[PDB]
Amino acid sequence: MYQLQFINLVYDTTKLTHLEQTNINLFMGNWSNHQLQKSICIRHGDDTSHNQYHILFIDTAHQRIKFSSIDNEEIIYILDYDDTQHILMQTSSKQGIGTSRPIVYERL
């Protein structure tokens, strides 16, 4: 059994450009990392969702999104695109020393 974390991105898509939506959409889905025995489910949630996250930046040049949990802005998640079946997720704290390596997640 793996641990499954939900990430519900909260945003009004009617206010985004098509390019912005395309870039967020690269990260939607069910993802897993074998070594960590961890899965993540990244979805477009809303105000009814638990596990809500606010997008800080959508980098359409580099296919990266940054986001944080609504009330815990000390931990920034950064997702990078690898291919249709792989994304990278980094969890970072401004207050820490060093780099947490991004972790490769494969699509389920």
mmCIF file of C-alpha atoms in Angstrom:
data_model
loop_
_atom_site.group_PDB
_atom_site.id
_atom_site.type_symbol
_atom_site.label_atom_id
_atom_site.label_comp_id
_atom_site.label_asym_id
_atom_site.label_seq_id
_atom_site.Cartn_x
_atom_site.Cartn_y
_atom_site.Cartn_z
ATOM 1 C CA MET A 1 0.000 0.000 0.000
ATOM 2 C CA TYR A 2 1.163 3.496 -0.857
ATOM 3 C CA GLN A 3 0.386 6.762 0.858
ATOM 4 C CA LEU A 4 -1.879 8.951 -1.304
ATOM 5 C CA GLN A 5 -1.768 12.759 -1.027
ATOM 6 C CA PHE A 6 -4.422 14.936 -2.658
ATOM 7 C CA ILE A 7 -3.499 18.297 -4.179
ATOM 8 C CA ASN A 8 -6.592 20.300 -5.131
ATOM 9 C CA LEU A 9 -5.539 23.352 -7.075
ATOM 10 C CA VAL A 10 -8.110 26.131 -6.606
ATOM 11 C CA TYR A 11 -8.420 28.632 -9.463
ATOM 12 C CA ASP A 12 -11.040 30.231 -11.673
ATOM 13 C CA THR A 13 -10.167 28.896 -15.073
ATOM 14 C CA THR A 14 -12.494 31.391 -16.803
ATOM 15 C CA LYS A 15 -9.855 34.047 -15.987
ATOM 16 C CA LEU A 16 -6.864 32.185 -17.436
ATOM 17 C CA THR A 17 -5.484 32.160 -20.938
ATOM 18 C CA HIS A 18 -5.554 28.984 -22.969
ATOM 19 C CA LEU A 19 -1.724 28.856 -22.715
ATOM 20 C CA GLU A 20 -1.945 29.066 -18.919
ATOM 21 C CA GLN A 21 -4.550 26.280 -18.757
ATOM 22 C CA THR A 22 -2.493 24.066 -21.078
ATOM 23 C CA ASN A 23 0.520 24.407 -18.774
ATOM 24 C CA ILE A 24 -1.428 23.647 -15.550
ATOM 25 C CA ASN A 25 -3.091 20.708 -17.290
ATOM 26 C CA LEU A 26 0.290 18.993 -17.814
ATOM 27 C CA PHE A 27 0.298 18.209 -14.089
ATOM 28 C CA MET A 28 -3.238 16.902 -13.591
ATOM 29 C CA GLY A 29 -3.630 13.251 -12.809
ATOM 30 C CA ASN A 30 -2.539 10.364 -10.667
ATOM 31 C CA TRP A 31 1.170 9.996 -10.095
ATOM 32 C CA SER A 32 3.422 7.660 -8.149
ATOM 33 C CA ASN A 33 6.977 7.202 -6.913
ATOM 34 C CA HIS A 34 8.005 3.613 -6.257
ATOM 35 C CA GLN A 35 10.939 4.316 -3.933
ATOM 36 C CA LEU A 36 8.866 6.545 -1.638
ATOM 37 C CA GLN A 37 5.743 4.351 -1.836
ATOM 38 C CA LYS A 38 3.859 7.583 -2.389
ATOM 39 C CA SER A 39 1.166 8.639 -4.805
ATOM 40 C CA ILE A 40 -0.209 12.096 -5.523
ATOM 41 C CA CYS A 41 -3.544 12.974 -7.060
ATOM 42 C CA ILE A 42 -3.401 16.469 -8.628
ATOM 43 C CA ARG A 43 -6.822 17.854 -9.550
ATOM 44 C CA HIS A 44 -8.574 21.091 -10.222
ATOM 45 C CA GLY A 45 -10.635 21.448 -7.035
ATOM 46 C CA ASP A 46 -12.787 24.289 -5.786
ATOM 47 C CA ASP A 47 -14.144 25.863 -2.566
ATOM 48 C CA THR A 48 -15.789 22.573 -1.541
ATOM 49 C CA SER A 49 -12.459 20.742 -1.647
ATOM 50 C CA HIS A 50 -10.203 19.712 1.172
ATOM 51 C CA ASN A 51 -6.423 19.884 0.574
ATOM 52 C CA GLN A 52 -6.681 23.233 -1.219
ATOM 53 C CA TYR A 53 -3.679 24.898 -2.836
ATOM 54 C CA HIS A 54 -3.187 28.348 -4.326
ATOM 55 C CA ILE A 55 -1.124 28.768 -7.499
ATOM 56 C CA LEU A 56 1.657 31.322 -7.075
ATOM 57 C CA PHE A 57 3.069 31.241 -10.607
ATOM 58 C CA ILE A 58 2.428 29.571 -13.977
ATOM 59 C CA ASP A 59 5.602 29.581 -16.027
ATOM 60 C CA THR A 60 4.446 29.027 -19.592
ATOM 61 C CA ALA A 61 7.976 29.446 -20.978
ATOM 62 C CA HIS A 62 9.409 26.590 -18.942
ATOM 63 C CA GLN A 63 6.343 24.390 -18.078
ATOM 64 C CA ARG A 64 6.581 24.931 -14.336
ATOM 65 C CA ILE A 65 3.946 25.761 -11.732
ATOM 66 C CA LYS A 66 4.538 26.898 -8.165
ATOM 67 C CA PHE A 67 1.881 26.619 -5.482
ATOM 68 C CA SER A 68 1.367 26.424 -1.759
ATOM 69 C CA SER A 69 -1.293 25.197 0.631
ATOM 70 C CA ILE A 70 -3.786 27.962 1.400
ATOM 71 C CA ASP A 71 -2.681 28.593 5.015
ATOM 72 C CA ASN A 72 0.923 27.264 4.916
ATOM 73 C CA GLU A 73 2.856 29.495 2.546
ATOM 74 C CA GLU A 74 6.225 28.558 4.080
ATOM 75 C CA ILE A 75 6.333 25.388 1.927
ATOM 76 C CA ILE A 76 6.413 26.009 -1.839
ATOM 77 C CA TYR A 77 5.759 23.146 -4.249
ATOM 78 C CA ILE A 78 7.315 23.438 -7.668
ATOM 79 C CA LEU A 79 6.279 21.088 -10.443
ATOM 80 C CA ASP A 80 8.267 20.662 -13.653
ATOM 81 C CA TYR A 81 7.260 18.843 -16.802
ATOM 82 C CA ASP A 82 9.342 15.907 -18.049
ATOM 83 C CA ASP A 83 6.989 14.127 -20.465
ATOM 84 C CA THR A 84 3.379 12.906 -20.690
ATOM 85 C CA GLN A 85 4.162 10.180 -18.186
ATOM 86 C CA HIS A 86 6.577 11.967 -15.808
ATOM 87 C CA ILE A 87 6.610 15.133 -13.780
ATOM 88 C CA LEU A 88 8.987 16.425 -11.143
ATOM 89 C CA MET A 89 7.855 17.689 -7.770
ATOM 90 C CA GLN A 90 10.021 19.705 -5.409
ATOM 91 C CA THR A 91 9.008 20.743 -1.952
ATOM 92 C CA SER A 92 10.979 23.753 -0.677
ATOM 93 C CA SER A 93 11.196 25.942 2.419
ATOM 94 C CA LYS A 94 12.643 29.458 2.358
ATOM 95 C CA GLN A 95 13.750 28.902 5.939
ATOM 96 C CA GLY A 96 15.861 25.806 5.253
ATOM 97 C CA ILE A 97 19.440 25.396 4.017
ATOM 98 C CA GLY A 98 20.192 23.557 0.797
ATOM 99 C CA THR A 99 18.214 22.032 -2.054
ATOM 100 C CA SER A 100 15.592 19.336 -1.758
ATOM 101 C CA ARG A 101 16.047 17.433 -5.048
ATOM 102 C CA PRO A 102 12.875 17.263 -7.100
ATOM 103 C CA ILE A 103 11.319 13.825 -7.093
ATOM 104 C CA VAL A 104 10.239 12.118 -10.317
ATOM 105 C CA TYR A 105 6.653 10.919 -10.343
ATOM 106 C CA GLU A 106 5.326 8.569 -13.007
ATOM 107 C CA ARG A 107 1.742 8.601 -14.241
ATOM 108 C CA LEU A 108 -0.430 5.761 -12.986
#
